[PDB]
Paper text:
The structure was solved using molecular replacement once the space group had been correctly identified as twinned P21 rather than the apparent C2221 by searching for anomalous scattering sites in P1. The asymmetric unit consists of eight copies of the [name] chain. Chains A, E and S have the most residues modelled into electron density (Gly1–Lys86) with an extra helix beyond the end of the conserved domain (Gly78). Chain B has the least modelled residues (Pro4–Gly78); the other chains are between these limits. The final refined twinning fraction in REFMAC5 for the deposited structure was 0.463 for . Despite soaking and co-crystallizing with a range of substrates and substrate fragments, for example N-acetyl­glucosamine (NAG), polymers of up to five repeats of N-acetylglucosamine and NAG-N-acetylmuramic acid, and peptido­glycan fragments that are generated by a number of enzymes, we never obtained clear density for substrates in the active site. The structure displays a very high degree of structural conservation with the previously published structures of the catalytic domains of RpfB (Rv1009) and RpfE (Rv2450). In [name] two residues display an elongated conformation (42GVGN45), very similar to RpfE (137GSGS140), to connect α-helices 2 and 3, while a 310-helix (321GLRYAPR327) is present in RpfB. Based on the structure that we have solved, we propose that the five RPFs from [name] have similar substrates, although variation in charge around the active site may give rise to small variations in the specificity for different peptidoglycan modifications. The high degree of conservation of the RPF domain explains why the protein is functionally redundant, but most importantly shows that the auxiliary domain composition is mainly responsible for the functional variability.
Residue numbers in the entry: 1 to 86
Write the structure that this text describes.
């Protein structure tokens, strides 16, 4: 079973701050935009959601969009980009 390293992706995206909310239009450890978070079943502010809830919503984004949803940081997942970009 694959296990994307979302902690690694979060380090890339936010410096590992699962509660990131700096005013750049992105939220939480994985820097979700609100329209993507809502679209994949997230509610409220991603920065208020647990790491585990954030990861749950990322796993859904991955299945539908691939690691293209994190175009620079996706490689840090440890999944081969050539196979998981879509």
């Amino acid at each position: 079973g694959p296990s994307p390293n979302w902690d690694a992706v979060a380090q890339c995206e936010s410096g590992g701050n699962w509660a990131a909310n700096t005013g750049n239009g992105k939220y939480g450890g994985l820097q979700f935009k609100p329209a993507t978070w809502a679209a994949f079943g997230g509610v409220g502010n991603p920065a208020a959601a647990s790491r585990e809830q954030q990861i749950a919503v990322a796993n859904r984004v991955l299945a539908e969009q691939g690691l293209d949803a994190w175009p620079t940081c996706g490689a840090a997942s440890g999944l081969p980009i050539a196979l998981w970009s879509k």
